[PDB]
Amino acid sequence: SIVQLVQRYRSGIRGHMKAVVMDLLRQYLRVETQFQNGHYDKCVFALREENKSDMNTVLNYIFSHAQVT
Amino acid sequence: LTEEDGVHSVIEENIKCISRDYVLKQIRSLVQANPEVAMDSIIHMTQHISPTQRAEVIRI
């Protein structure tokens, strides 16, 4: 719990205030790099296949990329 | 260890940062024993981004 206190704050407010916004941007990125790599249709089947087992997570996936612009 | 001159991890930035941070405290620490060197050090110290850096002291 103490190493987790420092884990909020080990690189100071500054690495983290970077890191966190940096992570979410990479969050946008990972999703949207697999999203567009050729064209939407053929790619969605590649989207379909990374997490075949469950589809509740998928609904947020499909929902996210609707307003890319 | 293996990837020399590769991409660095999060902590790698931190380890350089403590090393970088540690050198910085020494100059601060160095003036404490010998504050008279501070003033003369500035002309020499300013050789980087010098006009902005002289300005910052004047603002403060």
Side-chain angles (χ1 to χ4, degrees):
Chain A
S1 168
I2 187 55
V3 294
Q4 295 191 357
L5 175 51
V6 57
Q7 189 153 13
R8 269 82 62 80
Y9 290 146
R10 61 181 183 85
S11 299
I13 53 67
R14 188 168 64 256
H16 298 141
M17 63 82 189
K18 294 174 169 297
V20 298
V21 64
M22 283 172 74
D23 291 4
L24 72 56
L25 52 84
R26 304 287 90 189
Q27 187 59 52
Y28 175 86
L29 192 147
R30 172 185 188 81
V31 173
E32 293 194 352
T33 201
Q34 184 67 260
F35 179 60
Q36 50 168 7
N37 182 353
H39 177 95
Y40 175 74
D41 182 76
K42 165 71 168 79
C43 297
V44 66
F45 294 93
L47 270 198
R48 178 69 181 173
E49 290 178 24
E50 188 76 27
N51 312 312
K52 292 177 73 174
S53 301
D54 170 15
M55 278 72 72
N56 199 160
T57 315
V58 177
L59 178 154
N60 309 316
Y61 276 20
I62 292 327
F63 178 64
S64 167
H65 71 92
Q67 297 301 108
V68 182
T69 297
Chain B
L1 187 37
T2 52
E3 302 66 359
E4 70 293 350
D5 281 333
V7 174
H8 67 265
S9 170
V10 175
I11 202 93
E12 288 294 322
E13 186 211 335
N14 291 316
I15 296 159
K16 59 175 69 64
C17 192
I18 303 86
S19 167
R20 195 192 169 179
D21 176 42
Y22 177 61
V23 296
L24 181 164
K25 306 180 264 294
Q26 175 158 23
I27 307 304
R28 295 181 59 186
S29 322
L30 269 185
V31 297
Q32 292 304 321
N34 301 317
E36 70 283 352
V37 172
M39 189 49 74
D40 294 356
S41 70
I42 303 165
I43 65 157
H44 304 287
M45 275 302 285
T46 48
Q47 185 178 359
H48 200 203
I49 308 296
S50 281
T52 75
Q53 194 165 328
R54 302 189 175 92
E56 175 90 28
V57 69
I58 313 165
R59 305 190 272 273
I60 297 161

